[PDB]
């Protein structure tokens, strides 16, 4: 099973699924092999009904599409559509939160309120919205209308791009025509230009993709901004992760998906229903996280993380998961059929994301508490049914310190230098105690033994004194293998990095270091890492493509991950991807994305499936950036 | 060659291309066979990097996607994305025209003006915009801002849906949640819901597709509305079609693509440059049309149509095509490589639609006349080079009567009944002289011998007294085979239909009938057919799904055609498609689209590749509608 996942609790559930004859994601993978090489390489097109068109990577015909589309065009068009799909997901989440905030401050949704008024005012100031003498509710209404305006064309560009990146970066992007005009505008323009008989020049197509990737960035940054207003900005928290956070004696309820608009309410209401759950013979309601909605309540409330991404079915295989409460994105639709075998009540809550065989509870912000109780009573009913059934919860969990929003990181640093908080970080970059910064991001992927790339690469970088930050299911991978436990600093970290982590931790009254890896939140919270990196750029007076900062989507899967890797390149970062995107069928596209884009944005992709080699390549990238700054390396 | 195209001028150019070794669309098709059956059936998914996933139509594994997506989900998600792509194209065209109108009335683009102020005021009234005491420029500014607002969410739904369909139809659609909230909003929501781990219920997915198809309808109707304001509403015109409209002695310039914003200006400026073209030894500039931008200048100015869709390369093979002026959509990118062999200057003009190897002239509405001269001087230079080269223009053309906008049709009818113009049409439906109405729409497709389905089905329907209207490359197919020539009424038409066509024609002072088929314009001008059909619904007090009206996308290709077929179903029409869409891999999806959707919208798809069988099925559909109205059939 270790060839499937390096997570020992997942291995145990894989053995249980095997002997119970429950098909898993890995079984469905094996049944798909060998996979189609045309699609793997990107040399397939179904953009009109003359297709499917495919092109032989090598050999004889077919060499070209029926309409005359070249391999270069076909590959670029497919990639563009994946970027637009990802942008649509992140920005649909953000749009949902914009409407929730508008409703909250119009008196239409009383379960929701402004919890972070400091963040509200700072966002308003960044956007140019006056706050002087204005009521919070009116400021928030203006912030929500600005969020919504950024979806369409108007007399300004997308402000959740142009107000979050340094002016020098905006200038470079504007010169190349890369600043988005409107989030949904760009998504639709991608779909138009990539339809049959439209754009057919690889460079032109790919510049459109870079622009649409900044619409994805805008959606991420908007989603984080609005979620912090509504639910509070994360601060350091301590909790646990992996399947052993489930409890046989409790009603186990997993929140799974992306949008905390629901999950945050579930957390509160589950507290109120403790007695209504004890009367059923439970000890309480034990809310646990899966995927990014789990990260959201982990960062804000310390809710323990059950599992992530590719291994989500394994939470059900324990037999102890009484409900799985779903919104949208990254939910394997298999959970609906597995639920029959495992006794789990699967519940969907969003109109545009249903699964045949699941129970649907329409959620409306106006009824949030009402809906939460309806959902949690179905969970309690399910716990009652498994009275006296054995369960198999692996007794495996890690300790997790998290909650490192950019504000939290700056506050932590400010204990060392109160009026120039970024300076102690920069000081230790210059003196070599911190070699550079690596963000791990994105998914797991069934093609890669689960977590293997994240942990192999992180170990090499930590030993070389790289400051490692993580989000999404990259944060999930590292947390489940001990990388968010300060007890593991001595083992994992180079002496320079250990010295900094200990200095900061002890100055925040800890008697111990910060954890080896800093958890910066959900996938939309990749925007927090952008906030930190742009704040360092502004303090140093240099653009992001001169900083010793890199990113790794080490086991990417979702179209969202492709969009996010692309905006990391577009804002100036060397960006590793550890699974093959469908680009190898065109050398000219590959050369643009891994080489000549450097001349446009300063970032570039590093496509590398071997994780030891990837770690070497990321270190070289960091160290080239150090050299360009005149720093030893 | 008759197995490739039924167009004899295309057959002649196919022989020339063969002996010159110029590869064509049909050669590239043959080189693609056998095509992938997974993609043909819709049983392939590449929506994340765990894929490609495919499902065997029959047999053993694979049976399901890696994430657990069923055949039903995979097929519905692929279809939804095609609908969103089509909507993006039609509505991107409309958006372009909204910005052009705004610029024109702000004094930013003096080559453009309000040419149809009656249409402007009628549109304003339909939208609820006051006109009483307001300047035209201010009315138009309000109309353009309303067009742009319909792309995003706001306090009203998409008005280019809710103000163009009868209230009873809107009510049915609203009850099912099918009215779009915003055009780009719906496109983006499609892309989100169809991404990995989101919507996974075939009915839910397909209802989203129906809603997005009405966003495509809104884009079409907006594009027609704005283009009529700017360039004039079509009235009856007489011209010619097919390759023989090219002239060896002239500078032949083809306008190709979709948006008339450019082409309309080319037509005017080419008139001004006649002398500058005679000085080069031409007789003049001979502007000809390809695809829908050709239809646009055909409908408004009588510009002759050179060719359409699948046969576009053949215009270049004559050797006499000095320039091909491109905007976007439905342009085979092969034209750029063929141009080297044929001496043709291929010019692109829109930033989001370039072709490697073409010459790019950035077009800006503010410089329109300037750009037009630059482009037309490159054309003249190319004519000079082919001095003394032989050309092979097939001496094959048809006569074409066209320009039947809905206003033109109503005015024609009003000669028989001035104050109740729709009544003579309804009278002849009731008495059987007109059996019903069929709209032919959409493309040609290399899978189908060119034009064969359109002409086979049209002949059967005309002999049965069906009133046939056509747009796009369906209009192109029929015009090139004589169906727009009144001289062919006796041969083609049933006695009842001939009697009506003659009665109307003679009352419009013609001494002859209307043509056998009424050309209603470009693809966006399918909206004109909706205007006519909704006007008949309102006069009769019944919804569209009780009228004896059907549609046929007899040789569909483009994602736009899929979107348009879907909104034809959604507004209540039996809708034939004559090529296989990628749905046969899921029986449940097929049954929804061809059967149970009747219970939702009253329309339905008729998937039928044999054209004689298709004509029978369309007649049965018409005659079932007649019976439901109590009419003989
Ligand atoms: S757009 Fe061109 S390459 Fe793609 S399926 Fe259609 S003919 Fe083939
Ligand atoms: S979304 Fe599911 S079916 Fe599609 S490629 Fe990814 S794993 Fe396969
Ligand atoms: S030929 Fe396999 S992805 Fe299309
Ligand atoms: S397996 Fe051929 S279209 Fe994907
Ligand atoms: Fe996520
Ligand atoms: Fe068209």
From Swiss-Prot, chains A, B:
Inactivated by O(2). One of its GO terms (molecular function) is peroxidase activity. Its EC number is 1.2.7.4. Its cofactor is [4Fe-4S] cluster; [Ni-4Fe-5S] cluster. It holds the Pfam family Prismane. SUPFAM superfamilies: Prismane protein-like. [Ni-4Fe-5S] cluster binds at residues 258, 292, 330, 443, 473, 523. It is found in: Cytoplasm; Cell membrane. It catalyses: CO + 2 oxidized [2Fe-2S]-[ferredoxin] + H2O = 2 reduced [2Fe-2S]-[ferredoxin] + CO2 + 2 H(+). [4Fe-4S] cluster 1 binds at residues 36, 44. Coiled coil: none annotated. Keywords: 4Fe-4S, Cell membrane, Cytoplasm, Iron, Iron-sulfur, Membrane, Metal-binding, Nickel, Oxidoreductase. Homodimer. CODH oxidizes carbon monoxide coupled, via CooF, to the reduction of a hydrogen cation by a hydrogenase (possibly CooH). Belongs to the Ni-containing carbon monoxide dehydrogenase family. This is Carbon monoxide dehydrogenase 2. It comes from Carboxydothermus hydrogenoformans (strain ATCC BAA-161 / DSM 6008 / Z-2901).
């Amino acid at each position: 099973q270790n060839l499937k996942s390096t997570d020992r609790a997942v291995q145990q559930m894989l053995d249980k699924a095997k002997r119970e004859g429950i098909q898993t994601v890995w079984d469905r993978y094996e049944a798909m092999k060998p996979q189609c090489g045309f699609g793997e390489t990107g040399l397939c097109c179904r953009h009109c009904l003359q297709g499917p068109c495919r092109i032989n990577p090598f050999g004889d015909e077919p060499k070209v599409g029926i309409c005359g589309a070249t391999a270069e065009v076909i590959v670029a068009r497919g990639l563009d559509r994946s970027i637009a799909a990802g942008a649509a997901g992140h920005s649909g989440h953000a749009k949902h939160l914009a409407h929730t905030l508008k409703k909250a401050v119009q008196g239409k949704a009383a379960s929701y309120m402004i919890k972070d008024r400091t963040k509200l005012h700072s966002i308003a100031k960044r956007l140019g919205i006056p706050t002087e003498g204005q009521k919070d509710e009116d400021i928030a209404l203006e912030v929500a209308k600005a969020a919504l305006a950024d979806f369409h064309e108007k007399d300004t560009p997308v402000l959740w791009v142009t107000t979050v990146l340094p002016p020098s970066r905006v200038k470079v992007l504007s010169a190349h025509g890369l600043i988005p005009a409107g989030i949904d505008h760009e998504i639709a323009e991608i779909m138009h230009r990539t339809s049959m008989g439209c754009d057919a020049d690889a460079q032109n197509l790919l510049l459109g993709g870079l622009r649409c990737s900044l619409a994805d960035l805008a959606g991420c940054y908007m989603g984080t901004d609005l979620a912090d207003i509504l639910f509070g900005t994360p601060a350091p928290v301590v909790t646990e992760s992996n399947l052993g956070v489930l409890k046989a004696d409790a009603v186990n309820v997993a929140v799974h998906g992306h949008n905390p608009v629901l999950s945050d309410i579930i957390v509160s209401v589950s507290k109120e229903m403790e007695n209504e759950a004890r009367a059923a013979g439970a000890t309480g309601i034990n809310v646990v996280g899966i995927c990014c909605t789990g990260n959201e309540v982990l960062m804000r409330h310390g809710i323990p993380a059950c599992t992530h991404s590719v291994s989500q079915e394994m939470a059900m295989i324990t037999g102890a998961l009484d409900a799985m409460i779903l919104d949208y994105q990254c939910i394997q639709p298999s959970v609906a059929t597995i639920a029959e075998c495992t006794g789990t009540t699967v519940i969907t809550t969003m109109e545009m994301s249903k699964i045949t065989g699941a129970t649907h509870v329409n959620f409306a912000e106006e009824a949030a508490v009402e809906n939460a109780k309806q959902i949690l009573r179905l969970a309690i009913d399910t716990f009652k049914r498994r009275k006296g059934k054995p369960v198999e919860i692996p007794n495996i969990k890690t300790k997790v310190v998290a909650g490192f929003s950019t504000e939290a990181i700056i506050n932590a640093l400010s204990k060392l230098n109160a009026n120039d908080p970024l300076k102690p970080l920069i000081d230790n970059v210059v003196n070599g105690n911190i070699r550079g910064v690596c963000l791990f991001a994105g998914c797991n992927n069934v093609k890669v033994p689960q977590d293997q790339n994240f942990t192999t690469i992180a170990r090499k970088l930590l030993k070389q004194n790289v400051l490692v930050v993580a989000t999404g299911c990259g944060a999930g991978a590292l947390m489940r293998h001990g990388f968010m436990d300060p007890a593991n600093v001595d083992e994992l970290c180079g002496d320079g990095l250990k010295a900094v982590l200990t200095a900061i931790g002890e100055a925040n009254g800890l008697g111990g270091p910060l954890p080896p890896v800093l958890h910066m939140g959900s996938c939309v919270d990749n925007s927090r890492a952008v906030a930190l990196v742009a704040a360092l750029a502004n303090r140093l007076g240099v653009d992001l493509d001169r900083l010793p900062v890199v990113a790794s989507a080490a086991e990417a899967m979702h179209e969202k991950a492709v969009a996010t890797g692309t905006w990391a390149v577009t804002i100036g970062l060397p960006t590793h991807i550890g699974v093959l995107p469908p680009i190898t069928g065109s050398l000219p596209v590959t050369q643009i994305l891994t080489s000549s884009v450097k001349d446009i944005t300063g970032g570039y992709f590093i496509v590398e499936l071997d994780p030891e080699t990837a770690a070497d390549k990321l270190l070289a990238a960091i160290n080239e950036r150090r050299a360009g700054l005149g720093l030893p390396w």
